[PDB]
């Protein structure tokens, strides 16, 4: 079993305003156990876009079924895209930790551009 890797294969995704953007992400292992989260931006001012664990995110749909024990696909879809959604989106693996989950590894990021 190699070490966990978070793979975002797309440098860029172009979406028309109003359409649905797909952000691809794959984890190459399930060790360690822990949730995947999506952010726009890096650093402390990161916007939480999706969280596998908890929370309500009405614009976001996962491509795959995450409740599958064997799942490694963490791609998401964001509906009703407006120009305010442009930015760089990061797929980040967390590990359970003590009290709260802590960042483990991050994908390289995907830039989202609107109106083609």
């Amino acid at each position: 079993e190699e070490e966990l890797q978070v793979i975002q294969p797309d440098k860029s995704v172009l979406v028309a305003a109003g359409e649905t953007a797909t952000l691809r992400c794959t984890a190459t292992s399930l060790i360690p156990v822990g949730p995947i989260q999506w952010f726009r931006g890096a650093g402390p001012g990161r916007e939480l876009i999706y969280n596998q664990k908890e929370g309500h995110f009405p614009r976001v749909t996962t491509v795959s079924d995450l409740t599958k024990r064997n799942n490694m696909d963490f791609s998401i879809r964001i509906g009703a895209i407006t120009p305010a959604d442009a930015g760089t989106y990061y797929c980040v693996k967390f590990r359970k930790g003590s009290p709260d989950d802590v960042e483990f590894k991050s994908g390289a990021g995907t830039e989202l551009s609107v109106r083609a």
Partner: antibody
Amino acid sequence: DVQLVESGGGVVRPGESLRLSCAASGFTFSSYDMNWVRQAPGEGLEWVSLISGSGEIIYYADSVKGRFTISRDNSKNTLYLQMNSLRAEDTAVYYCAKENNRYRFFDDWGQGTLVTVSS
Amino acid sequence: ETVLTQSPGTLTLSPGERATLTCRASQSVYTYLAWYQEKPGQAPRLLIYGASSRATGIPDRFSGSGSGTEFTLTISSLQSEDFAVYYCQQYYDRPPLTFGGGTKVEIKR
């Protein structure tokens, strides 16, 4: 091999305009993101702008935002930088750089061309 | 943005010595750090990508290491053509793409 030939640099006055060209050869120009990077005399490397292979994804550095316009012409295998309302701080050697397929680092560079903004 | 700081600005070493150049990021960039070489008067050229991957055609004495916020470019034995300026560049946090300030390797005598 991969080649990037730049041109258009020169001496201009503040507020005037210039146009830089980066003619490519030895690779499929249409499928690579291209960047402009500058280096003021005695200073370090500074990212200026980037344009996707398709030409529709475009970012600028804040210090040039609204004055410079990047574009490409895949039919002529040349990248352009349109510099308008130039300031003294724009004096630099300007390099064109070809990005890696997946990541935003620069695989190949042009020879550079010099822009002097002076009165 | 993410700020990269290279220290020191000038590194003074004798030919054939080991050079160890540092690059520190103000916040984590994981493994998404490149190193460029700039010999006097020439355009920059890529040496290292992905913190540790040697670019095609780059001599073996160049090696990169580190992750997160601390990176190191090592030259095992300095040749004459290695006295130049070296820049690190991160591509995790973008835009903007950001460069370090540069370290110049000068000949000791």
